Amino acid sequence: GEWFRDNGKHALIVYDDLSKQAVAYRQLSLLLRRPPGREAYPGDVFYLHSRLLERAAKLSEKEGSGSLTALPVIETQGGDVSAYI
């Protein structure tokens, strides 16, 4: 998406989903014996998705007015929003 965005164009990315990504990252960190944080997730998963979703933005004009637009998806559990992810 950044390739299009730095070519001045406009791209919509749709992740589906971030939840399976979080599960996979938890699996890798636990298998790499990293000490898990809350709900057995790794600590920097907030950092993980923050550096995922801040790569999608609208560029300024001197950058070519490119844009990457983002649609993350979350499956929830019984209509919960209070979970960690």
């Binding site: 014996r33 000490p35 898990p36 944080g37 809350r38 709900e39 057995a40 019984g78 919960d80 209070s82």
Partner: protein, 269 residues
């Protein structure tokens, strides 16, 4: 399904059961008050209805239908049950015009038959009905409706059969035309020169309206007290379920977070 959701919900339902309990006690107080008015209306009405037992005013051969509920609801199968008796008698004569006394029976009947309704009485179910009010409304019926022109008049009230039971009940009213036409009527000595049937019919209308109001009022408060008792019972049962749900939720939360506390202490050096 958090501890917060179940806790706030259980507290809400405890407040609900407390309010239904207070409402049941207030309903008992108002019911005990309204029984006095019901008996004092009934014993007054029986002095005129024993006459109609003796003076057999039984009519022969357009109809006026009057239903009696209050403005409020919250008394269960009364507003729909009396409307169903209205349905029974109104399927017989669909031309029969309706004068409701009570907002809730008006909303019951206006959805199914907005045609026959031509007068609506409001500001009723706050108090025990007085003869001032009942005689005033009976005056209004011979002022805007002229029910003496109407051949057949039916009054629909609610008879409390017990404190735990009830009945939507019908009362016929015989016009003063029928009163001179009555067979067991010349037995009673009456002055021709005093308009005694044409005023006693009004007096009959006023008394039967007062009896219908003071009887359906007590029936409403009886079924309302019953409904609030059932509400307190159901609320107590649901509190008994959700308290156990709350305890399982709390124990599971503490255990599950202690699992993560241990698991972090598990993968040490």
């Amino acid at each position: 399904a958090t501890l917060k959701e179940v806790e706030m919900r259980l507290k809400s339902i405890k407040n609900i059961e407390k309010i239904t309990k207070t409402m049941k006690i207030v309903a008992s107080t108002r019911l005990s008050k309204a029984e006095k008015a019901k008996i004092s209306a009934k014993k007054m009405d029986e002095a005129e209805q024993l006459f109609y037992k003796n003076a057999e005013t039984k009519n022969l051969d357009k109809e006026l239908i009057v239903a009696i509920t209050s403005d409020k609801g919250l008394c269960g199968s009364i507003h729909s049950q009396l409307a169903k008796a209205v349905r029974r008698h109104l399927n017989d004569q669909p031309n029969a015009d309706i004068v409701t006394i009570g907002d809730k029976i008006k909303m019951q009947l206006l959805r199914t038959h907005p045609n026959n309704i031509k007068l609506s009485i409001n500001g009723i179910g706050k108090d025990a009905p007085t003869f001032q009010e009942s005689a005033l409304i009976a005056d209004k019926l011979l002022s805007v409706m002229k029910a003496g022109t109407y051949p057949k008049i039916s009054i629909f009230y609610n008879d409390p059969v017990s404190s735990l039971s009830f009945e939507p009940s019908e009362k016929p009213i015989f016009n003063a035309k029928t009163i001179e036409q009555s067979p067991s009527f010349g037995k009673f000595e009456i002055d021709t020169d005093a308009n005694v049937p044409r005023d006693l019919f009004e007096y009959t209308l006023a008394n039967q309206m007062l009896t219908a109001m003071a009887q359906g009022y007590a029936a409403e408060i009886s079924a309302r007290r019953n409904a609030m008792d059932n509400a307190s019972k159901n609320a107590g049962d649901m509190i008994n379920r959700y308290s156990i749900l709350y305890n399982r939720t709390r124990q599971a939360v503490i255990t599950n977070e202690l699992v993560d506390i241990i698991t972090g202490a598990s993968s040490l050096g």
